Ligand binder design. Structure first.
Ligand code: ONQ
Length: 164
């Protein structure tokens, strides 16, 4: 059973206009099997639109490629992103009053490097409100997080979405 193809694609922005299907493929095949690899071009001039996409055989290969950033392709640092609202912060809801910072850290640190954990408390009483924000050092952590169907933190089934 193959993962859905949409989850195996990387949009690559900021390409050199000299990058071709072939040179983009030669670069990104270092991190996995590519089932597709295309540079977007103008239909009339064939001049590069400066972006393209690659599709890996598995999600683990996408992960490998993203963990190998920054990618310098044909002399230019490019901008890969998963199949964009490009943010580094998530909202985590449904954590109730018993969820602590270490619960969130221990779970989310395996998605990316955490810079801020903010457990929300009531302005008047100081009681926990049952949600939190986590800020990572990079957007791919968030992109991996929000495409999961489920997140279980401290026994709670949480709602997780991109924040601001
Ligand atoms: C700092 O960014 C991170 C931080 C952690 C991970 C992680 O645990 N996953 C392993 C993997 N091969 O993808 C991946 C990326």
């Amino acid at each position: 059973p193959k993962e859905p193809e949409q989850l195996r694609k990387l949009f690559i922005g900021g390409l050199s206009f000299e990058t071709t299907d072939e040179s983009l493929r030669s670069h990104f095949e270092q991190w996995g099997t590519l089932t597709d690899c295309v540079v977007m071009r103008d239909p009339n001039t064939k001049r590069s639109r400066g972006f393209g996409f690659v599709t890996y055989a598995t999600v683990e290969e996408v992960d490998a490629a993203m963990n190998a950033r920054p990618h310098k392709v044909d002399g230019r640092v490019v901008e890969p992103k998963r199949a964009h609202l490009t943010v580094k912060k998530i909202f985590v809801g449904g954590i109730k009053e018993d969820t602590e910072e270490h619960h969130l850290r221990d779970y989310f640190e395996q998605y990316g490097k955490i810079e801020v954990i903010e457990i929300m408390t009531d302005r008047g009483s100081g009681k926990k409100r049952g949600f939190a924000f986590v800020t990572f050092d990079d957007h791919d952590s968030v992109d991996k997080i929000v495409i999961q169907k489920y997140h279980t933190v401290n026994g709670h089934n949480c709602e997780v979405r991109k924040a601001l």
